């Protein structure tokens, strides 16, 4: 079983991913760890990539893509979930041609739908209990709305991390995702539009009841 998953920052994508690869026993291949296996453990491609990195440059796709495929072959031999790559349409199209050339089928693409404005807001609405950071508090998600200026769960003092209030970096990351011309949503639409031709199933998830979404999906797989 081979899955792609797409979703903006603050859609709980990593969470849904995790739930999926547990239930179906898949290897969660994330775009960061690909470069670690390579650029760390020094593969032929890692070595060539690091020359670009060490210069202030991004890796070109004809290095990036072969790398993604090598990780999928070796770590993904029994089923994989790809999160975070492809970020764009040039990458998406190249990825898909590379996949066909190596005969790896996609079985499901998953897209977590969520409006730009609502996504920013779940990032910004997110407060951390000082007693236990796992205690989920969010001004903008009702189910988990905090209790005054203190933790919904245990009533400890809760603060904001200022990476969550960095509208600079959040909008840069979202300008890329919600880019329907050639960015991440364009990458997902590209797959959506060939789902039937290629015979994979494309699953849309309403990103706005954390565990009623976790079985709109569990239901739709195998
Ligand atoms: Fe707490």
Short mmCIF file of C-alpha atoms and ligand atoms in Angstrom, two decimals:
data_model
loop_
_atom_site.label_atom_id
_atom_site.label_comp_id
_atom_site.label_asym_id
_atom_site.label_seq_id
_atom_site.Cartn_x
_atom_site.Cartn_y
_atom_site.Cartn_z
CA UNK A 1 0.00 0.00 0.00
CA UNK A 2 1.45 3.33 -1.14
CA UNK A 3 0.10 6.70 -0.01
CA UNK A 4 0.70 10.43 -0.58
CA UNK A 5 -0.70 12.90 1.86
CA UNK A 6 -1.09 16.67 1.46
CA UNK A 7 -2.08 19.38 3.86
CA UNK A 8 -1.28 22.82 5.09
CA UNK A 9 0.45 23.72 8.30
CA UNK A 10 -2.00 23.36 11.21
CA UNK A 11 -4.31 20.77 9.67
CA UNK A 12 -3.11 17.92 11.91
CA UNK A 13 -1.58 16.22 8.90
CA UNK A 14 1.34 14.63 10.72
CA UNK A 15 -1.20 13.30 13.23
CA UNK A 16 -3.44 11.70 10.55
CA UNK A 17 -0.39 10.40 8.79
CA UNK A 18 0.80 8.68 11.96
CA UNK A 19 -2.64 7.09 12.50
CA UNK A 20 -2.65 5.81 8.89
CA UNK A 21 0.85 4.22 8.95
CA UNK A 22 0.03 2.49 12.30
CA UNK A 23 -3.22 0.91 11.07
CA UNK A 24 -1.66 -0.17 7.72
CA UNK A 25 1.86 -0.70 8.94
CA UNK A 26 3.54 1.68 6.45
CA UNK A 27 6.92 3.38 6.50
CA UNK A 28 6.33 7.13 7.14
CA UNK A 29 8.73 8.75 4.64
CA UNK A 30 9.07 12.41 5.41
CA UNK A 31 10.76 14.96 3.19
CA UNK A 32 13.29 15.89 5.95
CA UNK A 33 14.44 12.34 6.75
CA UNK A 34 15.03 11.54 3.04
CA UNK A 35 17.84 14.10 2.99
CA UNK A 36 19.17 12.63 6.28
CA UNK A 37 19.45 9.07 4.98
CA UNK A 38 21.15 10.53 1.83
CA UNK A 39 23.09 13.72 2.82
CA UNK A 40 23.86 11.96 6.16
CA UNK A 41 24.80 8.29 5.24
CA UNK A 42 26.51 9.81 2.10
CA UNK A 43 24.97 8.15 -0.94
CA UNK A 44 26.16 9.18 -4.46
CA UNK A 45 23.17 11.49 -4.60
CA UNK A 46 23.67 12.84 -1.04
CA UNK A 47 27.22 13.80 -1.94
CA UNK A 48 26.04 15.67 -5.07
CA UNK A 49 23.18 17.35 -3.16
CA UNK A 50 25.41 18.50 -0.30
CA UNK A 51 27.53 20.45 -2.82
CA UNK A 52 24.38 22.52 -3.55
CA UNK A 53 23.23 22.88 0.05
CA UNK A 54 26.70 23.98 1.25
CA UNK A 55 26.52 26.82 -1.25
CA UNK A 56 23.11 28.25 -0.27
CA UNK A 57 21.28 26.46 -3.02
CA UNK A 58 18.36 24.09 -3.23
CA UNK A 59 18.93 20.65 -4.71
CA UNK A 60 17.73 20.42 -8.35
CA UNK A 61 14.87 18.01 -8.98
CA UNK A 62 16.91 15.56 -11.04
CA UNK A 63 18.85 14.95 -7.82
CA UNK A 64 15.94 15.35 -5.39
CA UNK A 65 13.60 12.99 -7.30
CA UNK A 66 16.02 10.03 -7.69
CA UNK A 67 16.64 10.39 -3.92
CA UNK A 68 13.00 10.24 -3.01
CA UNK A 69 12.76 7.09 -5.18
CA UNK A 70 15.77 5.46 -3.61
CA UNK A 71 14.31 5.99 -0.15
CA UNK A 72 10.96 4.62 -1.29
CA UNK A 73 12.61 1.48 -2.69
CA UNK A 74 14.76 0.70 0.30
CA UNK A 75 12.85 2.02 3.38
CA UNK A 76 9.43 1.78 1.56
CA UNK A 77 9.77 -1.84 0.30
CA UNK A 78 6.54 -2.77 2.19
CA UNK A 79 4.26 0.24 1.79
CA UNK A 80 4.88 3.93 2.28
CA UNK A 81 3.35 7.25 3.23
CA UNK A 82 5.05 10.26 1.66
CA UNK A 83 4.52 13.54 3.58
CA UNK A 84 5.81 16.94 2.52
CA UNK A 85 7.08 16.13 -0.95
CA UNK A 86 6.17 17.13 -3.75
CA UNK A 87 5.88 20.73 -2.75
CA UNK A 88 5.12 21.90 -6.32
CA UNK A 89 3.90 20.93 -9.84
CA UNK A 90 7.25 20.56 -11.54
CA UNK A 91 8.28 18.26 -8.67
CA UNK A 92 4.91 16.45 -8.72
CA UNK A 93 5.05 15.69 -12.44
CA UNK A 94 8.66 14.55 -12.23
CA UNK A 95 7.89 12.40 -9.20
CA UNK A 96 5.07 10.69 -10.97
CA UNK A 97 7.14 9.88 -14.10
CA UNK A 98 9.92 8.61 -11.98
CA UNK A 99 7.48 6.38 -10.10
CA UNK A 100 6.06 4.89 -13.26
CA UNK A 101 9.52 4.30 -14.67
CA UNK A 102 10.30 2.26 -11.55
CA UNK A 103 6.80 0.73 -11.62
CA UNK A 104 5.75 1.81 -8.14
CA UNK A 105 2.00 2.38 -8.03
CA UNK A 106 0.26 4.97 -5.86
CA UNK A 107 -2.79 3.51 -4.16
CA UNK A 108 -4.25 6.62 -2.37
CA UNK A 109 -3.67 10.38 -2.35
CA UNK A 110 -5.00 12.11 0.75
CA UNK A 111 -5.73 15.78 0.86
CA UNK A 112 -6.69 17.52 4.08
CA UNK A 113 -8.95 20.44 3.01
CA UNK A 114 -8.81 23.53 5.18
CA UNK A 115 -9.27 27.21 4.39
CA UNK A 116 -6.14 29.46 4.43
CA UNK A 117 -7.66 31.77 7.06
CA UNK A 118 -8.82 28.87 9.30
CA UNK A 119 -5.40 27.12 9.05
CA UNK A 120 -3.38 30.31 10.05
CA UNK A 121 -5.82 30.56 12.97
CA UNK A 122 -5.33 27.09 14.34
CA UNK A 123 -1.61 27.87 14.32
CA UNK A 124 -2.05 31.16 16.13
CA UNK A 125 -4.79 29.92 18.48
CA UNK A 126 -2.51 27.31 19.99
CA UNK A 127 -1.39 27.77 23.63
CA UNK A 128 1.00 25.51 25.67
CA UNK A 129 0.24 24.34 29.27
CA UNK A 130 3.38 24.76 31.40
CA UNK A 131 2.65 21.59 33.43
CA UNK A 132 2.36 19.23 30.55
CA UNK A 133 2.95 20.41 27.01
CA UNK A 134 0.83 17.54 25.52
CA UNK A 135 -2.35 19.06 26.94
CA UNK A 136 -4.09 20.36 23.78
CA UNK A 137 -5.36 23.95 24.16
CA UNK A 138 -6.57 26.14 21.31
CA UNK A 139 -8.50 29.45 21.39
CA UNK A 140 -9.86 28.75 17.88
CA UNK A 141 -10.95 25.10 18.04
CA UNK A 142 -13.98 24.83 20.28
CA UNK A 143 -13.62 21.17 21.35
CA UNK A 144 -10.32 22.19 22.96
CA UNK A 145 -10.92 25.90 23.94
CA UNK A 146 -8.73 26.78 27.00
CA UNK A 147 -10.08 27.59 30.46
CA UNK A 148 -9.71 31.33 30.99
CA UNK A 149 -6.01 32.11 30.60
CA UNK A 150 -5.17 28.48 31.90
CA UNK A 151 -5.13 24.81 30.83
CA UNK A 152 -8.35 23.11 29.73
CA UNK A 153 -6.92 19.91 31.24
CA UNK A 154 -5.21 20.66 34.51
CA UNK A 155 -5.47 24.38 34.92
CA UNK A 156 -1.73 25.08 34.63
CA UNK A 157 -0.45 28.39 33.22
CA UNK A 158 -0.43 28.33 29.42
CA UNK A 159 1.66 30.46 27.08
CA UNK A 160 2.20 30.89 23.27
CA UNK A 161 5.37 29.78 21.45
CA UNK A 162 6.33 32.68 19.28
CA UNK A 163 6.92 30.43 16.21
CA UNK A 164 3.08 30.03 16.30
CA UNK A 165 2.69 33.90 16.29
CA UNK A 166 5.18 34.40 13.43
CA UNK A 167 2.75 35.54 10.71
CA UNK A 168 5.87 36.16 8.59
CA UNK A 169 6.97 32.55 8.34
CA UNK A 170 3.44 31.10 8.45
CA UNK A 171 2.27 33.08 5.44
CA UNK A 172 5.38 32.20 3.51
CA UNK A 173 4.68 28.51 4.16
CA UNK A 174 1.00 29.01 3.23
CA UNK A 175 1.68 31.09 0.18
CA UNK A 176 3.49 28.01 -1.07
CA UNK A 177 0.78 25.50 -0.09
CA UNK A 178 -2.28 27.42 -1.23
CA UNK A 179 -0.62 28.29 -4.49
CA UNK A 180 -2.96 26.81 -7.03
CA UNK A 181 -0.95 27.92 -10.08
CA UNK A 182 2.13 25.81 -9.39
CA UNK A 183 2.47 25.28 -5.61
CA UNK A 184 1.34 22.49 -3.30
CA UNK A 185 -2.39 22.60 -3.90
CA UNK A 186 -1.58 22.59 -7.66
CA UNK A 187 0.55 19.48 -7.01
CA UNK A 188 -2.43 17.78 -5.35
CA UNK A 189 -4.88 18.83 -8.06
CA UNK A 190 -2.50 17.43 -10.62
CA UNK A 191 -2.87 14.03 -8.85
CA UNK A 192 -6.61 14.52 -8.25
CA UNK A 193 -7.10 15.04 -12.01
CA UNK A 194 -5.41 11.82 -12.97
CA UNK A 195 -6.81 9.63 -10.13
CA UNK A 196 -9.28 7.90 -12.42
CA UNK A 197 -6.87 7.50 -15.46
CA UNK A 198 -4.26 5.96 -13.13
CA UNK A 199 -6.61 4.00 -10.89
CA UNK A 200 -5.63 5.37 -7.49
CA UNK A 201 -8.18 6.72 -5.06
CA UNK A 202 -8.13 10.34 -4.01
CA UNK A 203 -9.41 11.03 -0.50
CA UNK A 204 -10.53 14.49 0.67
CA UNK A 205 -10.65 15.22 4.37
CA UNK A 206 -12.64 18.01 5.95
CA UNK A 207 -9.93 19.47 8.28
CA UNK A 208 -12.55 21.24 10.50
CA UNK A 209 -13.64 16.81 14.89
CA UNK A 210 -9.92 15.60 15.27
CA UNK A 211 -11.15 11.92 15.73
CA UNK A 212 -14.29 11.96 13.45
CA UNK A 213 -11.81 12.76 10.66
CA UNK A 214 -9.57 9.88 11.87
CA UNK A 215 -12.20 7.36 10.61
CA UNK A 216 -13.68 9.13 7.60
CA UNK A 217 -10.23 7.98 6.50
CA UNK A 218 -9.78 4.66 8.37
CA UNK A 219 -13.14 3.75 6.71
CA UNK A 220 -12.00 4.56 3.17
CA UNK A 221 -8.85 2.40 2.78
CA UNK A 222 -9.04 -1.47 2.72
FE1 LIG B 1 -2.28 21.22 31.30
#
